[PDB]
Design a binder for this molecule. Structure first.
Ligand SMILES: [Cl-]
Ligand SMILES: [Cl-]
Length: 162
């Protein structure tokens, strides 16, 4: 298991524009197009992202290309962020993937807001971080995914994904 396989499980793959759990236009492997209520605004973000006139449909190669870019971007946002970078550097390889997963889902700003959990993660207080992570809109809105990510931080193994 790795970050790509982990996010593919959590995000799924859809080749036509769809609404995510929050109701936002999305495509591929959780690639958010726009928070705007307009399907035309989504189609236009999609064409610009892909570089061709898509009419709301992309191929598997194209979905995987956006995915690679988004994972790369999530990693780069962690490393550029003063709050996230030291947590990431402190973590083993498996828990690093859990942090990337969170950033991919909710953005670097959203994750940097988990100040108390991040401190507990840095201190390697795994059971306590797991309890604090669960006290969140994140956990209450997407509990099955959040539980898999929290388990990964708690145990440092891929058991929630096998
Ligand atoms: Cl893009
Ligand atoms: Cl979920």
């Amino acid at each position: 298991m790795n970050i790509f396989e982990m996010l593919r499980i959590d995000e799924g793959l859809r080749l036509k524009i769809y609404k995510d759990t929050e109701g936002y236009y999305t495509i591929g492997i959780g690639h958010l197009l726009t928070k705007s209520p307009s399907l035309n605004a989504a189609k236009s973000e999609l064409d610009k992202a892909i570089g061709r006139n898509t009419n709301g449909v992309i191929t598997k190669d194209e979905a995987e290309k956006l995915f690679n870019q988004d994972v790369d971007a999530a990693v780069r946002g962690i490393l550029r962020n003063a709050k996230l970078k030291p947590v990431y550097d402190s973590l083993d390889a498996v828990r690093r993937a859990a942090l990337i997963n969170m950033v991919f889902q909710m953005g670097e700003t959203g994750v940097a807001g988990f100040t108390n959990s991040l401190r507990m993660l840095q201190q390697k207080r795994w059971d306590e971080a797991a309890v604090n992570l669960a006290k969140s809109r994140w956990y209450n809105q997407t509990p099955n995914r959040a539980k898999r990510v929290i388990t990964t931080f708690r145990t440092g193994t891929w058991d929630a994904y096998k």
